[PDB]
Amino acid sequence: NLVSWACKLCRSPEGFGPISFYGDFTQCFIDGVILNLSAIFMITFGIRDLVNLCKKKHSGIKYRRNWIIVSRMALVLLEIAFVSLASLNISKEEAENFTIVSQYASTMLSLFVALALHWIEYDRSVVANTVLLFYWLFETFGNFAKLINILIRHTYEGIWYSGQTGFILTLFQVITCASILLLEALPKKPLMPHQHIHQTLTRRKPNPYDSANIFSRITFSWMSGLMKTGYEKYLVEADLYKLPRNFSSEELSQKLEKNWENELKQKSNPSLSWAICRTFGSKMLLAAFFKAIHDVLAFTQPQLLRILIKFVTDYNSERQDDHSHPQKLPIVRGFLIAFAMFLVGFTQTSVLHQYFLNVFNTGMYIKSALTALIYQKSLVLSNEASGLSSTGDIVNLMSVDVQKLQDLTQWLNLIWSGPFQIIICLYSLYKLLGNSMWVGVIILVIMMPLNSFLMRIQKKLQKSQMKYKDERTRVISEILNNIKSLKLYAWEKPYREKLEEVRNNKELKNLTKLGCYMAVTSFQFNIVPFLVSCCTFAVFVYTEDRALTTDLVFPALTLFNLLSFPLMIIPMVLNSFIEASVSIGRLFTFFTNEELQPDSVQRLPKVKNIGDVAINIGDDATFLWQRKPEYKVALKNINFQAKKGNLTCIVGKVGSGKTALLSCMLGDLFRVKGFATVHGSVAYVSQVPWIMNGTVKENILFGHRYDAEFYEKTIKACALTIDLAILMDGDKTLVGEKGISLSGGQKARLSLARAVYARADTYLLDDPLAAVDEHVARHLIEHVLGPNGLLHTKTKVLATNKVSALSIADSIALLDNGEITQQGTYDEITKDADSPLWKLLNNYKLNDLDFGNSDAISLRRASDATLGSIDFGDDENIAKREHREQGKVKWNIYLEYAKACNPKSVCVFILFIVISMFLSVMGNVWLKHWSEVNSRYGSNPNAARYLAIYFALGIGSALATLIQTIVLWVFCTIHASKYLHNLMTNSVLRAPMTFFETTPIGRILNRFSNDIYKVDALLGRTFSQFFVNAVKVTFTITVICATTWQFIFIIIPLSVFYIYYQQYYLRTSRELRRLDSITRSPIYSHFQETLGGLATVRGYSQQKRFSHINQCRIDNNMSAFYPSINANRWLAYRLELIGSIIILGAATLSVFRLKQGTLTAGMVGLSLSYALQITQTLNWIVRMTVEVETNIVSVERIKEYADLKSEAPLIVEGHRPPKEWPSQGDIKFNNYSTRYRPELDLVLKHINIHIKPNEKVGIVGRTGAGKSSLTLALFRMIEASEGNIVIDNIAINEIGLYDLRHKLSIIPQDSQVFEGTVRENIDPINQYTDEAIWRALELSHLKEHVLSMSNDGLDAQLTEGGGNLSVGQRQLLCLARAMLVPSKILVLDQATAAVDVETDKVVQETIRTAFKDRTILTIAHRLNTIMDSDRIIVLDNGKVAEFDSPGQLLSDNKSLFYSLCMEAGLVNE
């Protein structure tokens, strides 16, 4: 019945059906659906906006009425005129059709609504309105479809289907609608001059996303200005924009806090997950809608491919039949199918990136909200509940688990969109191939567990690699820290060999195994998609009686990809869900954790009167440390009053209640009974000082206003004047994890100075004086604490056992057993000696997750994501910024890396990439030929032959891929890694000592561990994924151009645009990733800092300030992360647009070949099968260029360290001295003078001295006299500026450094021990016997201790830095090392040693017994040790002032040595 009503409405022969015989929409469908629904859309939503805009004030923003609005209104009036005039053109027969008249009427009404809406929108909107933009888009599209329809019917039937005047008016309506669309979208409104006078913007500019109309938001055009800016210069945090309106972490945290509190109150089973879903879940629903549309559009494409191959076949059949009534097929159908393919691609892109936009926004919301809520929770979290877990664990709760809940949102929609795509695909393939599809399904089902098994093995080998990398890093740190000892002892060779052993025979072995398993997975992912199709066709051809023709063949090839790649991602989704589940469990355990009692102590306004109670604990109060597992009473029946000005002291033993009575007044303790009141502001001084990372000045000010007068007075009172005079920048010196490490007393005085400067009304001093020196303690008691001091008007409570501090107290209470047993003034206790207080006092990395499934690029991306790996951060990227974006790529680095690899191996690897892709393409060409033969015969002749050849080509491609990956890993990457590490080691170990002094050890350890790992595990993979996809795109374009040579003229400008976008994305995304990485870290560091000082922050009540700082840092990280994400969308939209244009060009040129009569179905099948797959490869090439550009900086750094200028040669062939030398120990300096560095003055000046054989010499001088430089001059750690040295008649400048240093013994200034066995630390070369080592240990008095360490004896392990050995034991170990060396010369450095005397006398014993025959030079600091010597070198300002016997020197009263002994207090008379 009902359809007859539609057949009464429409009265045209083509009917109300959607697609006509010619392939375009019928005129009945255009009038009845497209233009009518567009008009109804306008009539509803435009009037909705017309209502919603007129409620807003007209003077919010003033725009001047220039040509823009006049043009819009005038052209809308013109459009109304044309619609009316065309409505007059309707003939008698045309008027019978309901659709035409209804369409014109509804369009007229919608045009009036749009005419009003333009005028209202111009004044009362800052962006071009979305309703108008979409309405004019649909109106242009509908009128253009009508114009195309009319042109087609005129061409094929010779009639203007609605009159010539109808045609020309439709043309003018197309033009006018397009012009109004562009005038709505592109122009930017002109502000009135009043607004610019009002403007005062000087901070970061507002975000352009808020000013972007819907076409700009879909295409992400708002990013282009930032991409251009970041391509012209290096980006800095001031160049970024503000966050959009709703991204502030305060607002999000408040929303989620409201929902979480409602969850806690409403339900007896609260859950954090449902609170998060209830808060932020709307955008995930919208994203789900978009993902569904994307899936449907993605599966539409093989249908269009099948229809176009069918059209080509039927067209060629009809033309051959004529060559050898129903309507002969029109060629317009092919062009319209091609344009349909283009439209499907474009819409798919535009929808997919709005899906990504929504999921990434939701992830950012979750991260900001949860980070803010964790921080806000930790401040109120009770002291003991905080004590339950380490600060590192809670910082990992913020750092890891919130990252996992962020990452979940990407994977979230795939739990339904996987099965959705799989069901659509299986239905489509069933409609194509029947029951043959099930073998293709079964192959993927079987291959999934094998793929998970391989992923398991790769996770195993990745963990093993991280273990071995940490081991090598430990060895490198050992070598670098003790580099001076290595150079002086000449031990660099055995330790280099040990390092090489560890590097080669464990790490590179594991890397070879990991490379082979990555080759196996590469072969798996290559062969399985082929096997699916091959076995499906095998089952089809042998069982179905249908001919395996082209339209069945190539759409099936397209569909098997869309089947495989969702199936092979679902396990990774489930894995992510499990990780997010445990993360939610940890977070929920943290948020439900117990908080402080909020009404423990009543804060009140301050007290003004002196002697009036400011702190009162009354009604016999009782306080608890804990309420779990039991009610542990801290303090029982306390009664305590403290009064303004009166210093009131708390006395007790350790754990007898000191900390509890102050933590009470902080409100940390839970209160059972009684009441407690604290008037006024509070200032807490912790028992263990807490220092913020920053300057001394900021540690003092602590958020208060800077007052120079009181600041200087405070520093004077707290006795910080001397220290802050000594410090590098004074009070601007950095302290904490960054900068200097202050002593305990210094930290205590800083905390006390902070408390003083705060000027709070009430002070709670938790024993600051313990760490302070007694005279400085007297200074403090006089200046700050005492009755005459600064705080004499403030209430002060001081828990301490110092009798001196207690003597000035105005009230004293002994607290023991958790009870105030006794309280009074000091006289009241002093009068009774037997009372208790009297006696007891006086007598006692990254993860760039951006995957969307149903592509092979996406299967690679997702499998890499689930393997995860690691890719560590950069450091001191700030220094190179001074160059400020010259932008030229250093291609010499690439060639030097290509030479690290064997270049012929690189050529072979590239060749096998080419051969793999060639065999794939030839397999598809053979499949085309086979399907054409099947089409000719109408059956499957000789199935075995064609199928065997296709199978052989597929396995050829698979084996070529396997050989490629095997060669890449085993031959190129590992060889380059070995060469680079060996080169860098041999360079660094031979560098002069000035390099190690200037360059921090942190940098060198970073180079050795992190950059070497990047060169090992990542760079080869990035190069592989670049080259494979580049060859794949080259061969795709080759195939398409082979089918239609005219395609060259399209791909040239498309490649120009491709290079343009790739350059912009490369530079800007590089810099935005840098900004994100640098801004991410301060959040967790700040959280660490806050967790170390919760009692202080709650003491000063700086909770709100610290929360604001954390929120600002979260927002400052999101401000850099947001463009970093949206740059990917900006790139990917344009590259998928380029792919869509490629599909359009290929299809249209194919249809143009069809017109000339030279086209078979197989050519279209092959060319469009290849064109459809290019979209994701095009962008994956660019993102691999970016990852290659990032990772090769490691090669640049390694080449930097390789190029260091070395020391003098270790062996000089023409000058090698004998084995006996130095046989007697004669030394001569002949006019020797030297400087530490070229940037410094001469340290030793014109030394000329002769040291006789076997004589014992002492060297003395004031600070800066250059004593230490002799230790470096003899061993040639510093070269000569003038003159030379001669040892046993051999000059020292001629000899090689190994021959020199190997035959001089030294007891160095800094005793250093290597992590290893005792025998290794005494004799790494294993040159000396165990008995000699035992005798050396015996004489150095270590033997018994070494035996007591373990049963291994000599082989007993020594930890890193000699942790299990005392400093004296280390010095005796160095003494043993010097003992075993048979050289006749000894240097005994003591320029800074002051540790112990008991080891000193043992050193003297070994000097006079073991070294009895050696020439001994003592670089002496302890002057008292010297007087046994023969001759003394008195250095003064670098020159040898005196060289004479101690007796002769002390004979002269005016001699410098006499003055030294006098000032030292050794020789007064």
Author numbering: 4 to 327, 336 to 855, 890 to 1514
Quote the original article:
Yeast Cadmium Factor 1 (Ycf1) belongs to the ATP Binding Cassette (ABC) transporter family and sequesters glutathione and glutathione heavy metal conjugates to the vacuole to detoxify reactive oxygen species and heavy metals (Cd2+, Se2+, Hg2+, As2+). Ycf1 belongs to the C subfamily (termed ABCC), which, in addition to the core architecture, includes several evolutionary additions, including an additional TMD (called TMD0), a lasso domain that links TMD0 and TMD1, and a flexible linker domain called the regulatory domain (R-domain) that connects NBD1 and TMD2. R-domain phosphorylation is necessary for activity, whereas dephosphorylation induces autoinhibition through an undefined mechanism.
